[PDB]
Structures are given as C-alpha cells and as structure tokens.
Amino acid sequence: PHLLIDAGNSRIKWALADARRTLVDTGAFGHTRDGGADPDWSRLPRPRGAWISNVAGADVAARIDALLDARWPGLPRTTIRSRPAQCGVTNGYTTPEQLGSDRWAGLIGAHAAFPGEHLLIATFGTATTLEALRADGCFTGGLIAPGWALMMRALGTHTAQLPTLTTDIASGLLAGAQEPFQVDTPRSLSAGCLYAQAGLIERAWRDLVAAWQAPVRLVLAGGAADDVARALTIAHTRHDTLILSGLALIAAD
Amino acid sequence: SEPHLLIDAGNSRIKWALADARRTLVDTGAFGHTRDGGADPDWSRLPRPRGAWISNVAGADVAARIDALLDARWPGLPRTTIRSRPAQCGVTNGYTTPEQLGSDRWAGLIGAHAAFPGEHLLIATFGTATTLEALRADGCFTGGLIAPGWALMMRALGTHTAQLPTLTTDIASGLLAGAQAEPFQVDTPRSLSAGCLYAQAGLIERAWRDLVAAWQAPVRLVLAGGAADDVARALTIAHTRHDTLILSGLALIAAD
Ligand SMILES: Nc1ncnc2c1ncn2[C@@H]1O[C@H](COP(=O)(O)O)[C@@H](O)[C@H]1O
Numbered sequence A: 001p002h003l004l005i006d007a008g009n010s011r012i013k014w015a016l017a018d019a020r021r022t023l024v025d026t027g028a029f030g031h032t033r034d035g036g037a038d039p040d041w042s043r044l045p046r047p048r049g050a051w052i053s054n055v056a057g058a059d060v061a062a063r064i065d066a067l068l069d070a071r072w073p074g075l076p077r078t079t080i081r082s083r084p085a086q087c088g089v090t091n092g093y094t095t096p097e098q099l100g101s102d103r104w105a106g107l108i109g110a111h112a113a114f115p116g117e118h119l120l121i122a123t124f125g126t127a128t129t130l131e132a133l134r135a136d137g138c139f140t141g142g143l144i145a146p147g148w149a150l151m152m153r154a155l156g157t158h159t160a161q162l163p164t165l166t167t168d169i170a171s172g173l174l175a176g177a178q179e180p181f182q183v184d185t186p187r188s189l190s191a192g193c194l195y196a197q198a199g200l201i202e203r204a205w206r207d208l209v210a211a212w213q214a215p216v217r218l219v220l221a222g223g224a225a226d227d228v229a230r231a232l233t234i235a236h237t238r239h240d241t242l243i244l245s246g247l248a249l250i251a252a253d
Numbered sequence B: 001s002e003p004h005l006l007i008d009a010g011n012s013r014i015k016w017a018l019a020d021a022r023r024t025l026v027d028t029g030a031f032g033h034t035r036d037g038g039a040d041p042d043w044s045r046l047p048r049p050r051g052a053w054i055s056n057v058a059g060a061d062v063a064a065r066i067d068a069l070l071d072a073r074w075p076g077l078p079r080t081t082i083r084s085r086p087a088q089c090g091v092t093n094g095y096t097t098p099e100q101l102g103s104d105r106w107a108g109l110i111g112a113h114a115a116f117p118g119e120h121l122l123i124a125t126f127g128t129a130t131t132l133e134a135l136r137a138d139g140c141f142t143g144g145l146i147a148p149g150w151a152l153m154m155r156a157l158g159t160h161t162a163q164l165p166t167l168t169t170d171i172a173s174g175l176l177a178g179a180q181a182e183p184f185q186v187d188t189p190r191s192l193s194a195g196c197l198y199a200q201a202g203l204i205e206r207a208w209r210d211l212v213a214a215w216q217a218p219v220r221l222v223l224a225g226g227a228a229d230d231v232a233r234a235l236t237i238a239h240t241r242h243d244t245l246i247l248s249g250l251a252l253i254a255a256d
C-alpha cells in the first residue's frame, strides 16, 4: 500500500499501488500558480508511506508535504533522487544525480516493462525527453527539448504577431489540414512545432539503430504522444505509466 | 544614383542594408532592441537614401523606434512599410490570407525566387523562430511551417522548468563543438543543447524529404540566419547557405 507522486513542471501525477504494485487508484492535479485544485484523497486508504519524484522545485515540494500532512498526519515520505545504479538500471550520466528523478523512475519502469529489449523512451511533458536504454539496463545517454505545448507557447510570447495556441486547439487545426507545409499561421505554427517533435525523435531513433546495429523499440509516453505518433513514419509503442511503475519498484525495494 | 535603405526588423534583431542598382547590397548591419539594451545603428558614414523600405514583424513599438531613428538621421526621408501580397516579383502567395504571411518571409521568398532561377526550393530561415517555405521554380509559394528557434527553445526550457538553466547559443555551441556532440548526451547542458539543435535539424530533414517525395523533383535546401552554422553541422543532407535573401527581396521591391 504505497502512494506514489510524480511532480512535473506542468502538473502533479499520483497513484496508489498495492502489494503486487497494481495501480488501483490514479489521478492528477495542476499547480497553484495555474489555478490547480487539490487532489481528492478522500476515498483513499492510508498508505504505509509516500514516494515522491519532484523536478518542479522547492515550493511544489512544500505543497506536497502540506497535502500529505493534511490527509494523513505524520505519513512516512521519501523524495527519490537519481542514483548511479538501481533496480536493474545503471546511470550513464557523468554525474548521475544530475539526471531528473522522473527520467530515472521512468527508466526503471521501462526496464521492467520491456525485458530483453533496447529502448528509445520518448516522454512528452513540459519538456520532451529522450533516453537510450539497453536491454542489460544501461542508460547510455539522452536528449532534452521543449514539449509541443511549450514550443508553441514560446512562439506566442516571444513574437509580436504569432498567436498562443493550446495543444487542444492545435490538434484540431491539424485534423482539418492536408503534411508539414501549411497555408495559414496557426496551422503552420502547430505543424512546425509538431514535426519538430517527430523529426527529433525519428532522427534519434535512426541514430540509435545505426549505432547499436540491433532492433530498438520506440516507446512513447505522455498526452502529446497521441498527436506526435500520427506524424511518425516509424513504428512506436505507447506506455503512459512508466514513471509511476518505476516509483512502485523503487518503493517495493 | 539614389540608394535605398532596407530595414529587416525581427523579434530579436533589426537588420539593415544600403542598396545600389537592382539589388547590390553596399553596406549592411544589425542592432538589438531597446528592451535588450541594444544600441543605435552606425549610419554616420552613409549618404542620404532616396527612401526606406521596411519589413517589421516586431510590432508597433519597434516600428516607432525605426521611424524615429530615420527621422533623426535623415529628416524628411520617404519610408515604405511592406506587407505580404497575393503576388509580387514573380512569387505567388499560397496563403489563404496572403497578408497574414510575415513580411520578412515574403521578402525572403522574393529574394530566393530571383537568386535561384528555375529551381524548387525549401527555405530555412533561423531567427527568433525557425521558418520553412516551400517554393516552386515557377514562383508558387505553396506552404510553410513555423517552429521556435534554437535560442528560444532553450530559453523556454530554462524559464518553464525548475531544474533546467537557460543556455545561450554561444554556450550551447561551445559545449557541442567537435567530438563533444553525440546522438545522445550524458549531462544536462549538452543534452539540452543537443536536443533542441537536433530538433532543428530533425525538423528540416523531415520537411525536406517530405517535399522531395511530394514534388518528385530536385529541391534545393537553402539556409539563412545566424543559427544556420550550428544546424548545418547537425544536418546529414546537403544545403546551400544564403543569408541575404530577405534584404535582397526588399531591394527588388524597392527597385521596382
Ligand atoms: N510588399 C509591398 N511592396 C511594395 N509596396 C508595398 C508593399 N506593401 C505595402 N506597400 C505600399 O505601402 C503603402 C501602405 O500599404 P498598406 O498599409 O498595405 O496600404 C502603400 O503605398 C503600398 O503600395
């Protein structure tokens, strides 16, 4: 009975896993700066403890603590950090702790979910992160880029004439369009940023395949994966619980 | 005998050129915005132009600053601010609403049409944003796309994440120089630098291959802007470097 928390820069994801690490309850809530509400932990049993992954800063760390203290007073909690090696995975970062804890947990989750496979993990959040993971557990390196939403948001705030589009709006725009090349501003913007994601991933995957001279499964995770997958001309696999599954394994050990 | 002053004002820098004949760029330069502590252009050695032709995508404040700079240096100088048209100088605007196309992209399209006669083009321009335009040999601008630039991508990561710092292109380029650059990185600043850069290159390569496959004909990739050098290294496909596209377009407009 462990509570797991995946705090990112855009929102805070949580889950409750039993003895068999089955995520019996899941949920998500936004940050206070974005008018985010609190999580509904009313119909939730008292966990033995809480395991936290937080890359969203000290204020979020404090808020999470307050939430736990309000619901379950004095609940045991642990904030995880990236380790040189853990749960079958080795950290290839020159300075292992520098790696985002969410990326670390996701690696641990992916290692278990796809045993005996080389992987390219594409996670779509505030940032788009890529990780190369060998079957033997070796995390050999990665890439970091802004996510689809962030790219368009950046265009809207740092130019005078470009509109600020949400992924909801952007996704609908591309649905009615017929290809990277568009004949209007919001579609050019939406397609330009989307194919920056697809182009990044596709180039990385072919680079990884050519480097390891072996099959590599491309794993996609995150809400934006839906829209990015539709532009991909290479095979891909969806798996949206890698981070929370990893936290379960970390909590279990 | 009368020279033309050409202004290309973007969201990051304001580029200018003094032009002779049809499109001969005699003097050139650039300067930053007031909000960035940018200085004023050195026009102290320039003769009085016949007029100024301006492309501005950076708003009314910048437009007012440019007018003020011109009024101070050359009082009474005629000025023209350009807007994207349905068709001009051999180029046909494929935009649903032609006027919505960035005037800098329009001028650049006009310059590319003249600079590469008889060729199908993919134009990659690197500024605050990275913009692509597909241009037919006959002059048909059939479509394009807009993505954030290399610097903007990293700035966005720096401001909207708690644990990532902001890297400049100078810092990123220095960290990725030589054997430092890899398909994947093992530290945060290089992973950040490479990820955004490979997003640039990846975007261009994807759009280029799709265009060639679509038109089923040769397509010349043309690069313009400051970040082009770094992006070029990341490219595995061939490319042509041609930075004066926009200023040449303005010159051709001013000559006509
Ligand atoms: N792309 C262009 N090329 C040449 N002249 C232009 C262009 N855009 C605008 N102008 C001129 O600028 C003035 C004002 O333009 P507008 O505000 O669009 O009516 C008019 O004299 C137009 O003919």
Ligand SMILES: CC(C)(CO)[C@@H](O)C(=O)NCCC(=O)O
Pocket (backbone or CB within 6 Å): A008, A009, A055, A098, A099, A100, A101, A102, A103, A125, A127, A129, A144, B161, B163, B164, B187, B188, B191
């Ligand atoms: C890159 C993000 C913001 C993506 O969530 C996060 O994983 C993070 O803060 N990482 C720290 C820097 C690094 O992973 O190299």
Ligand SMILES: CC(C)(CO)[C@@H](O)C(=O)NCCC(=O)O
Pocket (backbone or CB within 6 Å): A159, A161, A162, A184, A185, A188, B010, B011, B057, B100, B101, B102, B103, B104, B105, B127, B129, B131, B146
């Ligand atoms: C895309 C930028 C910002 C590049 O300078 C500029 O060309 C612009 O403001 N364009 C307006 C929208 C469009 O060109 O479709």
